[PDB]
Chain length 287, copies 4
């Protein structure tokens, strides 16, 4: 088998859908956007709350629209705002609600199909705030850490705020030239290990300035992209798609990808890269 | 609450020896012994030689029978003997031959299904591959508790033959030193000497002696497991199924299925699984009842 | 011994010694603050330019006073403000300037004694060093909880300036969130965002907040510590001996000497030790009484 | 680099008739700035009480059959050339219930630990493990499933019969390195790392008429001739050597050998700590 087999097709969804909702490709009725990962959208209507649970599946939430909701992790709440990269770690209590006036929508991504082929699905229901909102900020997210922290699997940061993260990308355009494949791209980091925010999924935020025509890249990580702002086209080895704000597309293994933008576009992505790099199977080609 | 599915399976060596023979559980069509792992009986007949190739799927070969063939890795050849845990590490050239009489059969293990779902399948042909390293080279270099001061291996173990003469005598020395674990008997894990880790990044491999008359306690793990009976006989209990086993048989213990063994005869069980990947993702879990 | 001999003796200096000036305890003539670390006071006069070099000795610079000056590391330069914990990683070119008025003094900490004992002292002058990197480049690239994708690093925190204004705000933000640790106040370790570990391999660095009125319990650690009052005032009880402290002073707690505090104002202490080397060797130890 | 110690050599046999090995650091009781070395004798029928300290130590047997060292449960015979470890914070003792004097080369990290301030130690307020237990458990490329240890190799005697046979096996597998001959580092099978965190140990075989070229490293190294004879150069100041002699190459002093026999050299230094700090260097 020279070169990676498909396992997943290129795929586009224009954020004119419902408006929970699964997104799947060439894996019809497998509930999975990739062969490894799951993606879908989720709505919480005003007043709704959810009970708190825990499972081995890892999960990220990237907020699409709506303010006044919150997600809690292990007793701590964090406000969800547009573009926030919220995580709920793999064996930590989580729940949410909005006592607000706005429907709130987000992108969920979980490694359900991967945990399912590894055989490692466990889940339990809670039988308790105790944790001031905003705690994780100074405790883990200003380049310093408590003396006796101790964790294994982590990222005590469960909200990579957009206002922060977007700002990074913008400050970087004053400081150098864009990379010709990816624009101004950065990976979200676990400040305890320098590693991935979560063990199975890696996550990225990238800016592609107006008028950008990057080159062709391939990676082994089938990749779920999400347009947080901006617009233009993408080419996914051959197939082309037009994208506008809040669309979502998937780039399968070894499919060349390129971007041609007509606005300053900020793309969010995630994939099983960490699992690949852990085994020594990640591979990249810029051409 | 748990899950998981590859189904318990058994194959008897006498009713399957009349033959590569892929074996699947209840994933029929999927060329796979587990949801992540592939396993087969390979046969190389006197006079056969396979050209050199490389692929980033990791692989192991446990010799079931036959003497006189050799496997080669990145240069050096190694004789293949009954019970040898040989491996062809990931992106490193490999080939094999049988310049002897006697047909040589072994058990193949590959993380095929796993690399296909991850998307990382590359492979290529040697452009054979001259020897370079005297046969036997790796044993003083990497197998005697020392190591060269300036060596750059990578992801996998420079020992590509963990020999049974050596490994069967560990388990045997261990019985005159102490109690047998009550679930496992005398079980040990093969180890990469450069890192202390698993021999290959995606697969783990274990050997275990279960003394004659042994009746272990029930255990579960998250890592679905492929067992090979290298020697011995007895009964096994896999979550709701029970098999009688004998020399060379093969059985699979799917995730979170209770295993326990009942032995007549000192039985040596080789197995393997995708444990390293679950430990790498903080998903491995064990319950010993 | 039973408990660490450890020698450097308890010491206190007092910002009354205005003067490139180092501190020695009871190790006279060794230019050592402790048995592994050097500490002193360097002044840059309004106009000076240091040429640029690299050495195996790690170094930190913690600004005590004056404004206008900069330091550069591998090309990029940053402003120096009161309370800033700046590094010059080992084997990477560094220099500074003062194009301003106002003399600029800082505390130097370097692993000088240690590296001599270990035998690892290399020193190179640069041939006549340009910019390369705009000012405030490391901030968004490494200090905002994200990293570049193909970034190459080595043992070195790419963050060379842990600003005080961000750092002081952390400890403040901590007071609003919970009680004070009974032994340290509100204490945090500066962290290498690439690794999560120590900013330098031989040196560790802390910032703690000791609210007004606080009366800590007594603690001990094997790491001989250099404390520096960025602000505030109070008492310190360093194993049987006690010192009065005020803004900018420095004092040393030698290994396994009990340390406790009693502040009359909200106090903020900078400290560093050879902790990292002791943890790397599994020799670090603390008792919280 | 400065490196504060000097080149030293001691003629075994001369010295032979515990003994501390001090260079030009007169009084510091340290063969290097970081390590201590010395000979220890254990007369027939003498037994030492069990004790422990967070200082690391090794023992390389010089001579004498009979006798053993016990570590946390198990004892091991001491045979000429065996690299025995007493990991930090693990009870150790020894004894010989046989005839004959038992000499051994002592290596410890004492200067390092004082300079760091981490000296703790206990006088043991007892078997539990059969002799040779560690050999199948740890030293046959396998390991127990639920091992867990740290900061220490579970193998506590790297038998010279084995170690020596490695070096021998290697002369049949390829050529000598122009600098070291056939050299090799002992390893912790649980980590692939060094047997203890502060000290690294090597065994090298210098063939018959070998004549190495010049090397430098930043770790002050202690050599001990297990067998053979020859000359050594240590940044100037050469030395002629023979069985069981010991010498020291200070940091960034060039080292070379010229042998007349087929000689084996055991060595230990503070390399682990260096490389851990990113401070280790080497020139050929
Ligand atoms: Fe959930
Ligand atoms: Fe193959
Ligand atoms: Fe300097
Ligand atoms: Fe001792």
């Amino acid at each position: 088998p020279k070169t990676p087999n498909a396992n997943c097709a290129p795929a586009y969804w224009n954020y004119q859908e419902i408006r929970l909702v699964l997104e799947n490709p060439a894996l019809r009725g497998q509930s999975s956007i990739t062969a490894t990962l799951y993606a879908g959208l989720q709505l919480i209507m005003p007043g709704e709350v959810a009970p708190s649970h825990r499972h081995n599946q890892s999960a990220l939430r990237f907020i699409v629209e709506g303010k006044g909701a919150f997600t809690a992790v292990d007793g701590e709440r964090t406000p969800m705002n547009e573009g926030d990269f919220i995580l709920t770690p793999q064996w930590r209590w989580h729940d949410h609600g909005n006592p607000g006036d706005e429907p709130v929508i987000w992108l969920d991504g979980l490694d359900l199909p991967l945990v399912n082929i590894l055989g490692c699905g466990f889940a339990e229901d809670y039988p308790p705030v105790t944790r001031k909102e905003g705690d994780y900020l100074p405790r883990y997210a200003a380049n310093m850490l408590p003396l006796r922290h101790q964790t294994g699997n982590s990222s005590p940061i469960f909200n990579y705020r957009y206002d922060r993260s977007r700002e990074v990308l913008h400050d970087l355009t004053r400081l150098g030239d864009a990379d010709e494949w990816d624009g101004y791209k950065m990976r979200y980091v676990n400040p305890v290990t320098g590693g991935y925010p979560m063990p199975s999924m890696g996550a990225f935020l990238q800016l592609l300035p107006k008028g950008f025509a990057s080159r062709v890249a391939r990676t082994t990580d089938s990749t779920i992209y999400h347009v947080v702002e901006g617009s233009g086209q993408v080419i996914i080895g051959n197939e082309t798609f037009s994208f506008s704000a809040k669309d979502i597309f998937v780039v399968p293994t070894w499919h060349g990808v390129s971007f041609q933008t007509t606005q300053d576009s900020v793309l969010f992505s995630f994939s099983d890269r960490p699992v690949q790099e852990a085994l020594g199977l990640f591979r990249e080609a810029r051409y």
